[PDB]
Design a protein around this ligand. Structure first.
Ligand SMILES: CC(=O)N[C@H](CCc1ccccc1)C(=O)O
Ligand SMILES: [Cl-]
Ligand SMILES: [Cl-]
Ligand code: NA
Lengths: 300, 305
């Protein structure tokens, strides 16, 4: 037993990380088969940060303006194109370490691992969630752009995130591996701000079910709630509305513990009213929202 | 910016994980050069685990009693020996993915990454501290025995931990890679309990420095203190004593933030005596003690492997 923030093993992603240089700008690229994916803003100069014309900056590049390095090996760029906010550099070598992979666009509430990289080398791995405001609370320094987020279900790597920028509140914005931004953000240094963030209600409930599976019962109560009454209370605490989809998704955890989803909702209403009274749940004195129903069933 | 519980990249270790089976027991092995390391308790039945005679159980077994599987490849065992509570299975093939590595023994308070594995297959990686009572607060299910803990320094993997068992409190016990237990534990089915734990003071301070580097500053104050004064408050709150060595190790973070260690100790004294008054530090309502000073320097400067 025990309950930990756990990331996927990073090895299958490590063997895909390269350094991409264009101008004086170096960041990370993802090398799959014969394509290197990286943030298109690698082609921006210091005066092209506010309103870059990516189509114009790209057409002025030759393949040999792109320096791609896989460890000590210079890769030969033989093609360049742009898909949304992702630059794709065709190279003359397929990565021999390419894992089985796919590209998946995730929804808010979903979790994934991030392999934080600098100069094409891995620094560390951690778990993140896509926040309801379409940001992630990452750990990223200058040089981290092109680091990716991923899940590994059953030997196949699902790439879901590529890191593009830090917003003024210190949270992170990026794209799927088709180059489409999560949320209303753009790859320009024009003033942008995340929407008000909310707590991921379904994930809190999943983590309360995990606490019960690990033998915590102190926060349970004898009450139930309607789905509608729960949402009226929870939104006063900046909690996301719980949908009938979310209720359904919790069904297996409901069945394993024999606590109905709306009984557990009453427990969460009460925890929001009382706080923890100097107690902890699974080692936290806050209600944790970065574990999904799927994460809890995998780990428990 | 941002600050997360961050593991080392696990790829160098993923290439060393194998499945070891002896009779009805399957758990994980570490394949380095031509030796597979695993818990010696792989040779035990249920009966055996109550009062095992490992010497006796092992001399009975032959090489062919150990089934070692590296993905879909059987390795041939050509030798078996025991070192303390670890079994060494010599195999006929050196691991071609053996990284630069050494075996190291860590101290309580030091952190490392665990690669959680099942049937020889890597499942998850997480960061954890060797607790002052020599347990780790792990996440392990049936079949995670032989999962390992490590640090990376440049291109060298330092292996520091092998998982052997769960204690009745849900915390975990194991050995270094030379088979020496961390803490007062034995590999038998018996009544064993974790000693009462204590907070790793130098790590809480490191984490307060991480918070300041990330602009979380409300807990800072005009006051300073002394080791002796702080250590009387520490002892009272079940905190490890702060040594001069610990002050020295925080040197870099004190320099890089403009908060002296004893200035930050005065912040920590006020937090222990007063609580957080409904506030949070780096998204926690508790004082976090599983980041070392080196963890904070590494994460906040982007050290790479
Ligand atoms: C050095 C670096 O990594 N800078 C990025 C923003 C760099 C950028 C440039 C052009 C358009 C959008 C974003 C960050 O992490 O904040
Ligand atoms: Cl999703
Ligand atoms: Cl309250
Ligand atoms: Na102070």
């Amino acid at each position: 037993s025990g309950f930990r923030k756990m990331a996927f093993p990073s090895g299958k992603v490590e063997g895909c990380m390269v350094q991409v240089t264009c101008g004086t700008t170096t960041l990370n690229g993802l090398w799959l088969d014969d394509v290197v994916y990286c943030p298109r803003h690698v082609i921006c100069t210091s005066e092209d940060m506010l309103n870059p014309n990516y189509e114009d900056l790209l057409i002025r590049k030759s393949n040999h303006n792109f320096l791609v390095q896989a460890g000590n090996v210079q890769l030969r760029v033989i093609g360049h194109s742009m898909q949304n906010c992702v630059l794709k550099l065709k190279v003359d070598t397929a990565n021999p370490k390419t894992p089985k992979y796919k590209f998946v666009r995730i929804q808010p509430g979903q979790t994934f691992s991030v392999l934080a990289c600098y100069n094409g080398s891995p620094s560390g791995v951690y778990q993140c969630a896509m926040r309801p405001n379409f940001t992630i609370k990452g750990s990223f320094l200058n040089g981290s752009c092109g680091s990716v987020g991923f899940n590994i279900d059953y030997d196949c790597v699902s790439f879901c995130y590529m890191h593009h920028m830090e917003l003024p509140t210190g949270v992170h914005a990026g794209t799927d591996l088709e180059g489409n931004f999560y949320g209303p953000f753009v790859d320009r240094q024009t003033a942008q701000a995340a929407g008000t963030d909310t707590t991921i209600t379904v994930n809190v409930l999943a983590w309360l079910y995990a606490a019960v599976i690990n033998g915590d019962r102190w926060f349970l109560n004898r009450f139930t709630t309607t789905l509608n009454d729960f949402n009226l209370v929870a939104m006063k605490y900046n909690y996301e509305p719980l949908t009938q989809d979310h209720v359904d998704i919790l069904g297996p955890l409901s069945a394993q513990t024999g606590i109905a989803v709306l009984d557990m909702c009453a427990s969460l209403k009460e925890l929001l009213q009382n706080g923890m009274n100097g107690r902890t749940i699974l080692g936290s004195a806050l209600l944790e929202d970065e574990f999904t129903p799927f994460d809890v069933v995998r780990q428990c």
